Amino acid sequence: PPTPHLDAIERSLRDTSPGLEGSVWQRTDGNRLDAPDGDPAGWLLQTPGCWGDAGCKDRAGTRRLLDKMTRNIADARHTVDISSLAPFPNGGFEDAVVDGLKASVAAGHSPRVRILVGAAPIYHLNVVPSRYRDELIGKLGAAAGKVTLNVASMTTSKTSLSWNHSKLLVVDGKTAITGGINTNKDDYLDTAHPVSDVDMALSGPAARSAGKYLDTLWDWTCRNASDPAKVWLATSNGASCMPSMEQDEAGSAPAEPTGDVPVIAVGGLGVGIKESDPSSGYHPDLPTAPDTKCTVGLHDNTNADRDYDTVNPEENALRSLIASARSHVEISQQDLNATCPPLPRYDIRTYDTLAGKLAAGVKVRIVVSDPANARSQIKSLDEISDTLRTRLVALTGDNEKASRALCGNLQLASFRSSDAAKWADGKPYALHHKLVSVDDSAFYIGSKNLYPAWLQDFGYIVESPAAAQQLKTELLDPEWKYSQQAAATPAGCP
């Protein structure tokens, strides 16, 4: 069974970060999209999952999500490995963690647990690691004696604004849930305007790849606990820091297949963990589009730093995923552009790839979060279409061609999940997908936004016509059904 899209992505990863294979990216065969029997699309964990109701009254997505989390953890035999943006899991997210661990202990096991969160310097931490550890210990009751906690918040670079942003749940390095959903009850659960987001659940060797990525973050995190400005750390039962929990779990036996789904796991180290992959002969011709509505404040890692690329292969991975499209791409994101200063307004290579797809007659759909959330960094959808026009002209020298491609081949809109322009409680819909789909064959689900950001992130790229058909039916077709009523008409179009 052929995988032209993964092939193209793996080529780009081998060119960019050969030395990070086996830790920050890895391609595997034999995975299973982990769907509960009776619900074959249930591996797709969207939230809230209330299409067609501005009252978001029947939240099938959230239900399925929290119960997959609980069950995955309830089945832990050795290791539970959680990462997220701060705060530490709370509300129903925490109940999943505690019920799962208690059930694991009840089954006779002694789980080792790492919970890791990134924290922006701006962010003042309500529940600090030691406070959060004590709360878990209290809720674990008599099970706490059987649970080895590691709990940490981290910031790898204040000046370059790098901290963990990956959203991972890895159990026994065998099951893994990942996507854009942070363990924050207020965004997703206790609200009449839930954030729309998506995770995916799988089992098999790609889960171990996610474990190896987390080992890479905890190796840095454990050592840098000597600097409390960067890492705050709390453990239970007098336990040491556990930097290689997943490698110990894996031992030396290779990972065993659970299905037939090929997957690339791909992450990034952000800034302040590893300067470069010295293995790499990556020598890019980088593009210099002078953005004159904000001459970048900080050093531009997204567009003008070869070294950054070598320790963040996810950037090129997403670029080549898009570039491997031969028929159509759907992009569902919070945003394509970042706030400048201090970050660059956009990723030039990403926009050049999209522009190239338009010029080639490839269909491009971009659905982003409503600008009224500004949970949105553009003042207008036309900032996206104008940038695509600028790059189109830069690459073809043909503004007439640019208008045909842009008016004929571009679908650009703000996100909606019902016929109403906003949630029934008056707040606009907020979109937090980090999703890219190509040719109804391969798709990215993970934490890496397409807009410029220099964080640790992680995600999976699946190539499966059956799975992508499910993604289309359960998410992309519904998204367009309601979002096209908020479509932009770009300047220069009828």
UniProtKB/Swiss-Prot annotation:
Enzyme class: hydrolase
GO cellular component, one term: extracellular region
Domain PLD phosphodiesterase positions: 160-187, 427-454
Catalyzed reaction equations: a 1,2-diacyl-sn-glycero-3-phosphocholine + H2O = a 1,2-diacyl-sn-glycero-3-phosphate + choline + H(+)
Biotechnology: May be useful in the production of emulsifiers.
Keywords noted in UniProt: Disulfide bond, Hydrolase, Lipid degradation, Lipid metabolism, Repeat, Secreted, Signal
Protein name according to UniProt: Phospholipase D
